[PDB]
Ligand binder design. Structure first.
Ligand SMILES: Nc1ncnc2c1ncn2[C@@H]1O[C@H](COP(=O)(O)OP(=O)(O)OP(=O)(O)O)[C@@H](O)[C@H]1O
Ligand SMILES: Nc1ncnc2c1ncn2[C@@H]1O[C@H](COP(=O)(O)OP(=O)(O)OP(=O)(O)O)[C@@H](O)[C@H]1O
Ligand SMILES: Nc1ncnc2c1ncn2[C@@H]1O[C@H](COP(=O)(O)OP(=O)(O)OP(=O)(O)O)[C@@H](O)[C@H]1O
Ligand SMILES: Nc1nc2c(ncn2[C@@H]2O[C@H](COP(=O)(O)OP(=O)(O)O)[C@@H](O)[C@H]2O)c(=O)[nH]1
Ligand SMILES: Nc1nc2c(ncn2[C@@H]2O[C@H](COP(=O)(O)OP(=O)(O)O)[C@@H](O)[C@H]2O)c(=O)[nH]1
Ligand SMILES: Nc1nc2c(ncn2[C@@H]2O[C@H](COP(=O)(O)OP(=O)(O)O)[C@@H](O)[C@H]2O)c(=O)[nH]1
Ligand SMILES: O=c1[nH]cnc2c1ncn2[C@@H]1O[C@H](COP(=O)(O)O)[C@@H](O)[C@H]1O
Ligand SMILES: O=c1[nH]cnc2c1ncn2[C@@H]1O[C@H](COP(=O)(O)O)[C@@H](O)[C@H]1O
Ligand SMILES: O=c1[nH]cnc2c1ncn2[C@@H]1O[C@H](COP(=O)(O)O)[C@@H](O)[C@H]1O
Ligand SMILES: [K+]
Ligand SMILES: [K+]
Ligand SMILES: [K+]
Ligand SMILES: [Mg+2]
Ligand SMILES: [Mg+2]
Ligand SMILES: [Mg+2]
Lengths: 443, 445, 445
């Protein structure tokens, strides 16, 4: 017998059916979950590819309400550093600010400012706050002396707040004193933190941003199953990563299942994603291993050769739906990874059961991406290619979310849970897809 | 008789001959002149086209050491306002700073700051300087009151410098007080100007910038010969334009010659460029009319169909050399306008005698050029409409163009622009030579 | 005045005129000179590009009767080591053979043989020759012991020849003893060298090979004018380089002229080439600086954008003839570098006066050229990056190039290179003539 399990469908095989709608696209909710423990304000994840996600793009994705997964084709220290870059970009309060002492030489401070990119340094003596020196102070060439003591704002002029003071109260004192740094101290005037105007303003600019409980942007990082995996995970957790993505070509394997279990056991406080998979049995296996989410996609990537080189794969719409049915009631989200060419595909991915969609090609070429711009597969199961320079990531995200919002309005879905569970597809033929593209007109 | 005056050559007809050299490309001088009275640190001018030069790109060109000519396909007041944007972008000292009164409401000031793009305002009541209010003050919600008086730095705390104080002693006092604005006053504490840290730093960031005597970036603006021209010139001069470009398809005409003369006589303190021309007799006519420079180019434009619609033109290498010969010894510069496709063409234009080169297509598509975007580029019928690829920041294109000129000067042994214009030699080539010059017989990656 | 020195011609502008001939292509001589002191059996040089010439291709070129110039985009020691690979590939006699001691462990020697690529080692203890150990001996696991002493051929069984013995009497003794290594000794049985059957056979297989006085293949190496140049030259000479190529974009400069003079004065026993140039005055300047040859070519390179980025160049046929005229009677050869697309171009270059021709693109993609592969070919910005088809063995390309030159010499009645350079004539043609020359009006299968 020719052993055929099912007919499997991809995005171009189906269209969403319009339904009665009372909620306009601009008014629907796009909030979803990446994992059991991480929420996203938009259902978008950037792929862990060396032409797509390093720190710069991961910051942008988090600011938009999604998240980026930093790729692993680099040294453990470099990946940890990239994760650190995202976590340190902004915060509710800098709890471990770089400090100087009164006898620190101004020349060191000038070099510190260059390397760090900021110029504000509390001045301490054995933990006790004794001054502050900032960019405007570093413009002063003092009459006498060559240390911080000669240009710092002295103790008697410091504006401070006690640990626990509300942010609004902290803001009023910042503005009244025409300063942009608030020194946070305890009852003995020991330095406990630093609040910056910049961080206040960044939070107001991106109120949708994906952040942890400390107000830091969220970020993920990929690991494999090779010999350096344990050391790599440890460095990423130490750098503050929110989610470790155990990311392989075949997640339904002993190696991946065992590594997912190991991360859950060794680092219980981090979220773990496992993949990639494309069947219900694989989803149950990874869920039983403790994955906080599964990533769905074997074959469909734009620059992916798996289906041609190995003959292996599952059309993505059916793969999503089979995984979603397997995980119904478990609380484990599924991330649809690969094959998204148009915003319309994203909407279809969501209606088939995805919680969020991972994309590579769509974000390759943006200003924030590493590096027309290069776009290559991470595998001999990938190819190297070119994508056009696309400008700022925000514009692509806006177009993708605009299409999803339009689809939710067309189907009457007011939020992601309704979009995932209520709308219906029609199955179409090759002719139906042609009618749905632009046809018979010069563009 | 078939009346043929000469054989005329264009860029692809000639190549520069290498010569014994002692100066490296990085060390040559690119300084030149746009007009009798305007110097440029690089020989680049952006074209007066509505897809190339408005204020944003003119600012960038001046910062790079060149200049932009603001186009005239817009209302008189709108063109003057674009000029004003360039002139007000930076300065050595703001001599007419916007001031407010103590009783001005904070909420009104907040909106003006949004509209003006700066938040620093000296506070004047009647004629007396009584405070200063800045962006950081405008963050304050005062316990009592809703006027500037409630959040301004008052008279007794103002940091000031007397008019004439060197700028290095003003900077020391700025830095000592951790402030970024210096109020300049006379002997009776009357406000005479405002110096900003931003302007100090902008000058340090772009030390090559093309600037006038007040430290303002230079800018030009195009005018035609139609009925509104007189008022347009007046409005542009009043806005501070450095050079008026009487810009027509045919500068060798009564219309342009008389208008150039009128500008020189009516506004003697502004520079005037006349064009476009392509012959020696035209160059002499404009010089006699008082032009401070001439613009050379009939036909060669990228988006130009003049040669095809009217059958008229002169290949640009010969046009440049003919005009340069006609103006030798007059002090009148010539600007080579149009036909530049590669940095190598720019070098050839200089050696043929150009003082600087005007370009449109190559700057269309930059971030600073007008338009949304893979950006539109159309002729200002004798022109066409088209698309060029989005090219990113202007600075990168300028860098490659000047790198090619620097290399050409190194190859010819030319240490500065004057030597490049007068000493190097061309060889004449065939179509085969041009093909050899270009990448040939290899797949390019 | 527009300063045009001449009309300059390239390959597609001219054709060779057939002349009365008595010598068949198969019978003409292709021998020529690379430099004052280096002869070549064919007029071919491979370019100093990182996609063309490292040791592997330089060996092949020398075996064919030409020479390779190893490129300089690599570390000083790495470039010297590439030179060493070529010089050590073959020899008349190995004068400094690697030796071992009786107590050297067999397992260590096995690894050294793997690293060295040969397995033949004279065995020396203190200063005395006491055995020889070879690949066949290293297959033996001795009953007792683990050192060379256990598997070597001992002193009493060594076959030796006295220094000076003709090579035909050494071969007879090699063959009589069914061995492939001859130990050369002096009057006190001290080791003076090692002769191998391989080297004997390599000389017989490539009787045209370009070799020095020691029977080693010739090789060149490129250097620039930067700060590390002095040490780079020293390292390359120490590795045995035959010719140093002071290789720059603009040889008519103080930088190159002074460096050429420095090489001639500091290392009088090495040949020095200077370039690149394209004029008579440049050729005389390099000859006066002491160059043993000049390299001609500014612009024509396949992957070269010099003409397009800088606007600089001289069509190659005229550049060759101008330099050849300048060097007539000096003894200084000229190498035509760049622009060769077809074997017919090579013939034209020779008749214009070249002594030999340097090529890059045509050798990129061969098995012997660097790189994996349908092979990369990029310029060493004034160059481009590209792809060329995988071309197989270098020998086949050389065979077709020399076949075309041989045919051209037969067509012109030129029996040798000196006659080809000095006697045949060109006709000047139009674009129509070039089109006629090329395959036209037929589908090609
Ligand atoms: N918490 C504070 N208490 C007292 N003085 C402070 C405090 N924070 C900053 N300052 C002082 O106020 C001045 C301005 O510092 P601030 O950190 O607001 O801006 P900056 O980063 O130096 O300037 P800019 O952001 O405009 O480049 C400096 O003299 C600095 O020492
Ligand atoms: N010449 C001056 N004399 C006295 N006080 C001044 C002067 N210039 C500015 N100040 C005051 O110093 C404070 C900071 O003003 P400044 O103009 O240096 O920066 P800003 O533009 O307000 O802040 P930022 O540039 O960081 O947004 C304000 O309280 C302002 O009133
Ligand atoms: N000059 C010599 N005198 C005495 N014995 C020698 C000499 N040269 C080689 N032999 C010996 O002859 C044998 C064969 O050595 P030879 O160098 O001819 O070939 P090989 O390189 O070992 O074998 P192959 O080339 O077939 O791999 C070895 O036992 C070696 O010790
Ligand atoms: N001062 C300071 N800022 C930090 C540190 N680590 C991260 N940051 C962030 O860097 C930014 C500094 O911005 P800002 O206060 O405007 O910098 P500055 O005024 O030029 O010194 C804020 O977003 C901080 O959260 C630190 O150790 N010290
Ligand atoms: N304050 C002020 N600046 C002006 C005016 N006209 C032009 N400018 C320029 O606008 C810029 C303001 O920069 P900056 O002082 O940093 O702005 P602010 O601190 O936000 O008020 C400077 O380059 C000034 O030269 C004016 O009337 N008032
Ligand atoms: N034995 C030996 N050969 C060398 C040395 N340096 C270069 N060669 C060359 O390496 C080649 C060795 O060839 P062959 O004698 O057949 O190698 P073997 O029989 O495997 O040891 C010859 O062309 C030598 O000229 C050396 O130090 N010792
Ligand atoms: O070379 C590879 N081989 C197989 N799959 C790949 C390779 N590189 C990336 N992928 C997958 O393809 C996804 C991106 O697909 P895209 O959004 O269609 O471009 C990634 O998130 C990976 O899951
Ligand atoms: O449509 C028109 N007809 C003829 N010339 C034009 C037209 N529009 C612009 N030009 C010229 O072409 C120049 C730009 O040429 P480009 O640098 O080759 O793109 C401008 O500076 C004008 O001199
Ligand atoms: O990028 C460069 N700029 C200019 N000339 C180059 C560059 N790279 C290589 N060349 C020259 O071009 C020659 C090869 O030309 P081809 O034989 O036509 O491929 C080299 O031997 C060099 O003289
Ligand atoms: K349609
Ligand atoms: K070329
Ligand atoms: K033919
Ligand atoms: Mg600051
Ligand atoms: Mg300010
Ligand atoms: Mg052997």
């Amino acid at each position: 017998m020719l052993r055929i399990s099912q007919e499997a469908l991809t995005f171009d095989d189906v269209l969403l059916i319009p339904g009665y709608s009372e909620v306009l696209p601009k008014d629907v909710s796009l909030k979803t979950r990446l994992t059991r423990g991480i929420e996203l304000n938009i259902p978008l994840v950037s792929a862990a590819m060396d032409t797509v996600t390093e720190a710069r793009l991961a910051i942008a994705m988090a600011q938009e309400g999604g998240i980026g997964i930093i790729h692993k084709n680099m040294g453990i220290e470099q990946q940890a550093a990239e994760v650190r870059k995202v976590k340190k970009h902004e915060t509710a309060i800098v709890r471990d600010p770089v400090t100087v002492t009164p006898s620190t030489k101004i020349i060191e401070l000038l070099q510190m400012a260059r390397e760090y990119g900021f110029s504000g340094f509390p001045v301490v003596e054995q933990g006790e706050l004794v001054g502050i020196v900032t960019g405007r102070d570093l413009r002063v060439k003092p009459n006498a002396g060559d240390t911080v003591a000669a240009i710092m704002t002295p103790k008697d002029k410091l504006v401070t707040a006690r640990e626990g003071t509300p942010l609004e109260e902290m803001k009023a004192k910042l503005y009244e004193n025409r300063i942009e740094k608030m020194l946070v101290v305890d009852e003995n005037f020991y330095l406990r933190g630093l609040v910056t105007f910049r961080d206040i303003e960044k939070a107001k600019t991106y109120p949708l941003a994906s952040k942890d409980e400390q107000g830091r942007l969220r970020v993920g990082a990929a690991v494999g199953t090779g010999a350096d995996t344990g050391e790599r995970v440890a460095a990423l957790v130490a750098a503050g990563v929110d989610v470790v993505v155990v990311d392989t070509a075949h997640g339904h394997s002993k190696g991946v299942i065992e590594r997912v279990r190991w991360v859950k056991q060794t680092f219980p406080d981090v979220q773990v994603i496992g993949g990639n998979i494309a069947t219900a049995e694989a989803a149950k296996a990874l869920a039983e291993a403790g994955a906080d989410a599964v990533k769905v996609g074997i074959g469909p990537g734009s620059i992916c050769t798996t289906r041609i080189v190995a003959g292996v794969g599952v059309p993505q719409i059916s793969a999503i739906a089979n995984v979603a049915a397997a995980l119904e009631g478990t609380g484990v989200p599924l991330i649809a990874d690969g094959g998204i060419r148009f915003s319309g595909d994203l909407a279809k991915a969501m209606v088939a059961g995805a919680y969020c969609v991972m994309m590579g090609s769509m974000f390759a070429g943006t200003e924030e991406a590493p590096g027309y711009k290069s776009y290559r597969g991470m595998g001999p199961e990938g190819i190297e290619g070119r994508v056009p320079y696309k400008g700022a990531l925000s514009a692509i995200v806006h177009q993708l979310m605009g299409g999803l919002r339009a689809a939710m309005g067309y189907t009457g879905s007011a939020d992601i849970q309704q979009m995932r569970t209520q709308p219906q597809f029609v199955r179409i033929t090759g002719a139906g897809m042609a009618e749905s593209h632009v046809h018979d007109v010069q563009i």
